[PDB]
Design a protein around this ligand. Structure first.
Ligand SMILES: C[C@H](O)c1nccn1CCCc1ccc(Cl)cc1
Ligand SMILES: [Cl-]
Ligand SMILES: [Zn+2]
Length: 299
């Protein structure tokens, strides 16, 4: 059967919050079967646990943010994408600060962290959410939708009105795999625009943002001196952001996702609509690896 996976070992990392600007200590730990991904705030007495699930999402305004009354864990999306990307079902994440470290602004460093620690198979069946019929959410000009598909396919369409794009709209479509995710989606960086610089920092946002952890874009061009890791990097990161946000569903998706000028707010808006719509999904497990559609890196 296709089994659940967890970390073989403990790993530690250290970095800075993009929005907060604080130093943060991050620890990753193996966890028991059916635990899912739990986020732990170790700088509080007692320790506070916010599970990584769609129903705990609070603020979605410029990042995906989990809420347990007083306490928050912020900017979870990139880390949760690496974890979905390598098929990590169960892990404890400990943070010493309110926000997850931005690192290089991509899922690459977390992928490096998970591969070095290693994957551990567990003696329990891996469960998936299968999309049985279409679900959609619209917020004026923006849109997002789950459709039935035999595997995992993420598609994105972005219609910026910035000179950097030459009047055109950006599109990329990915057929998800563990191999395709790491070379194809995982190195795609976070981006800011010069023209949000007043607005951004008035509300205490991107306090830790720099050319070292994001694409900084001036009106004329991309200021980062070696340019872009991918020609289509902006849109591959919007795909990195979704994959991460959808994994708060608690389980791998057999289905297709399509985004049209969508973001964290709508992505979370879509999950909740799907959970409510019980007729549009079911949970499934696989007796045989050959019968299962979606392919993961082997430990
Ligand atoms: C944080 C979120 O994951 C995300 N992905 C792409 C853009 N964003 C929003 C980041 C906002 C941001 C604003 C300014 C700067 Cl310098 C850097 C980042
Ligand atoms: Cl807090
Ligand atoms: Zn992002």
């Amino acid at each position: 059967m296709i089994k659940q996976r967890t970390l073989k070992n403990i790993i530690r990392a250290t970095g800075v919050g993009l929005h907060s600007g604080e130093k943060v200590y991050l620890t990753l730990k193996p966890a028991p079967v059916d635990t899912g991904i739990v986020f732990s705030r170790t700088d509080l007495d007692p320790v506070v646990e916010i599970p990584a699930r769609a129903e705990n999402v609070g603020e979605t305004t410029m990042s995906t943010t989990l809420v347990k009354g007083d306490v928050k864990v912020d900017t979870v999306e990139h880390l949760l994408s690496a974890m979905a990307g390598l098929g990590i079902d169960n892990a404890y994440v400990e943070l010493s600060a309110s926000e997850v470290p931005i690192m290089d602004g991509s899922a690459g460093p977390f992928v490096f962290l998970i591969q070095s620690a290693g994957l551990q198979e567990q003696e329990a069946a891996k469960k998936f959410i299968r999309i049985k019929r279409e679900v959609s959410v619209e917020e004026g000009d923006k849109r997002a939708v789950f459709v039935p598909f035999d595997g995992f396919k993420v598609s994105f369409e972005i219609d910026f009105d910035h000179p950097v794009f030459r009047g055109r709209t950006q599109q990329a479509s990915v057929d998800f795999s563990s191999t395709s995710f790491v070379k194809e989606v995982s190195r795609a960086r976070t981006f800011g625009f010069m023209r949000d610089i007043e607005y951004l920092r008035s509300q205490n946002l991107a306090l830790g943002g720099s050319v070292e952890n994001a694409i900084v874009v001036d009106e004329n061009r991309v200021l980062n001196e070696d340019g872009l890791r991918y020609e289509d990097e902006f849109v591959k990161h919007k795909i990195l952001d979704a994959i991460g946000d959808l994994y708060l569903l608690g389980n791998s998706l057999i289905g297709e996702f399509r985004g049209f000028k969508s973001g964290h707010a709508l992505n979370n808006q879509l999950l909740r609509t799907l959970i409510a719509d019980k007729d549009a999904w079911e949970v499934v497990t696989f007796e045989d690896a050959r019968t299962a559609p979606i392919s993961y890196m082997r430990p």
